[PDB]
């Protein structure tokens, strides 16, 4: 799959190459360690690419916003407040075939991130050894791909993404365990994004471009209007935003932020308020 590619603005588990069941874990307010995989948000990391530097910040997703930092001139690493220090940027360089990634410090590119036998981490000069190879796994792909899901608006604990009765229009509706409210989330390799298939009619969540900008269930198409970048909210892994590929500045949104059964679901410009936030869970 290309779903685990080192994309800007994606959130990952970062594992040692020797153990896919251990992940980089922010254990405290400052310290990181490899730990048994538990999928708490303190084990999830957003990549933020800096094009000028051709290097990334690696930001924990537990709400603290702290970023992986080399404690220059020492050999230790930690999570720290982002002050845009050169020691807070990392080159992520990948072996295309093995999928292994080297995490190389920007301030001193002689130093790479290393995991130790005792699960601690540090920086060190480069060897040919596996203790400096990491694997990145996209969190959302791992969790949601090929799963039957429900999607709740953050506006209300009992309003869900629903195909309308006897219409293709998608609306909010209270839960009634209906196939109109169940969506198969499937990653498309070509588009590098997701489709969401309504269980009732086997048709897909699609932006219908006109002045209303409603979403409807629509037949399978290669057109970008049917494809969605499913992400966590910038600093909250408990909520999702869905950006449409036709215009990735626009997202799945609730008309006038209304909560009534029947409220139109639409695609509108990103602002990130609660009307654009969704809670996705497996059926």
Q: Which domain holds residue 112?
A: 1-138
* Helix, strand, coil content of the chain in percent (nearest 5): 10, 45, 45
CB 210 within 8 A of CB 204: no
CA-to-CA distance for 132 and 116, rounded, in angstroms? 9
CB 189 within 8 A of CB 1: yes
Same domain, 119 and 226: no
Same domain, 94 and 207: no
H or E, element range at 129: none
Same domain, 166 and 184: yes
Same domain, 128 and 258: no
CA-to-CA distance for 240 and 151, rounded, in angstroms? 9
- Which residues pair with residue 216 across a beta bridge? 169, 206
Report the relative pairing of strands 183-188 and 193-198 from DSSP bridges. antiparallel
Resolution in angstrom units: 1.7
Domain count, the chain: 2
H or E, element range at 140: helix 139-144
Same domain, 279 and 147: yes
Tell me the C-alpha to C-alpha distance, in Å, between residue 3 and each of 190, 199, 279.
10, 24, 21
Residue 237 contacts by C-beta under 8 Å, 6 or more apart in sequence?
11, 41, 44, 61, 62, 139
Tell me the C-alpha to C-alpha distance, in Å, between residue 168 and each of 48, 158, 173, 179, 217.
38, 21, 14, 14, 5
Same domain, 238 and 224: yes
CB 100 within 8 A of CB 17: yes
Same domain, 88 and 151: no
73 burial type by CB count under 10 A (0-12 exposed, 13-18 middle, 19+ buried): exposed
- Which residues pair with residue 214 across a beta bridge? 266
Same domain, 84 and 54: yes
Domain boundary among 138, 153, 182: 138
Same domain, 159 and 254: yes
Same domain, 159 and 122: no
Nearest 5 degrees, angle CA 213-CA 215-CA 219?
125
Question: Which of helix, strand or coil describes residue 256?
Answer: helix
Tell me the C-alpha to C-alpha distance, in Å, between residue 205 and each of 92, 168, 181, 260.
34, 10, 11, 20
Domain boundary among 105, 138, 171: 138
* Residue 80 per-residue DSSP state: E
Domain boundary among 106, 138, 170: 138
DSSP 154-217: TT-TT-EEEEPTTSSBEEEE-----GGG-EEEEEETTTTEEEEEETTTS-EEEE--STT-BEEE
CB 94 within 8 A of CB 57: no
Residue 88: give its domain's CATH number: 2.80.10.50
Euclidean distance between the first and the last CA atom of the chain, given in angstroms as a whole number: 24
CA-to-CA distance for 273 and 216, rounded, in angstroms? 22
CA-to-CA distance for 241 and 34, rounded, in angstroms? 29
Same domain, 158 and 109: no
Q: Which two tokens stand for residue 36?
A: 């048994």
Residue 211 contacts by C-beta under 8 Å, 6 or more apart in sequence?
none
Q: How many CB atoms lie within 10 A of CB 138?
A: 20
H or E, element range at 74: none
H or E, element range at 144: helix 139-144
Question: Which of helix, strand or coil describes residue 236?
Answer: strand
CA torsion, points 63, 68, 72, 76, in degrees to nearest 10?
A: 100
CA-to-CA distance for 153 and 239, rounded, in angstroms? 10
Same domain, 127 and 143: no
CB 221 within 8 A of CB 259: no
Q: Which two tokens stand for residue 30?
A: 């400052």
């Amino acid at each position: 799959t290309n779903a685990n590619d080192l994309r800007n603005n994606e959130v990952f588990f970062i594992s040692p190459s020797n153990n896919t069941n251990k992940v980089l874990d922010k254990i405290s307010q400052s310290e990181v360690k490899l730990w048994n995989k538990l999928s708490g948000a303190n084990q999830k990391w957003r990549l933020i690419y800096d094009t000028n530097k051709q290097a990334y910040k690696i930001k924990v997703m537990d709400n603290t916003s702290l970023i992986l930092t080399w404690n220059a001139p020492l050999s230790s690493v930690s999570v720290k407040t982002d002050t845009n220090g050169d020691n807070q940027y990392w080159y992520l360089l990948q072996n295309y075939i093995s999928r292994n990634v080297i995490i190389r410090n920007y301030m001193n590119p002689n130093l790479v991130l290393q995991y130790n036998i005792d699960d601690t981490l540090m920086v060190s000069t480069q060897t040919s050894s596996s203790n400096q190879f990491f694997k990145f796994s996209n969190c959302i792909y791992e969790a949601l791909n090929n799963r039957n899901c429900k999607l709740q608006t953050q506006l209300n604990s009992d309003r869900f993404l629903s195909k309308n009765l006897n219409s293709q229009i998608i609306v909010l509706w209270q839960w009634f365990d209906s196939s109109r409210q169940k969506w198969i989330i499937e990653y498309n390799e070509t588009k590098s994004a997701y489709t969401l298939k309504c269980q009732e009619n086997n048709r897909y969540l699609t932006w219908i471009q006109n002045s209303n900008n409603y979403v409807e269930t629509y037949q399978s198409t290669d057109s970008l209007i049917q494809y969605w970048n499913i992400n966590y909210l910038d600093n909250d892994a408990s909520k999702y935003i869905l950006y449409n590929l036709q215009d990735t500045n626009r997202v799945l949104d609730v008309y006038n932020s209304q909560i009534a059964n029947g409220t139109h679901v639409i695609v509108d410009s990103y602002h990130g308020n609660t009307n654009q936030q969704w809670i996705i869970n497996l059926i």
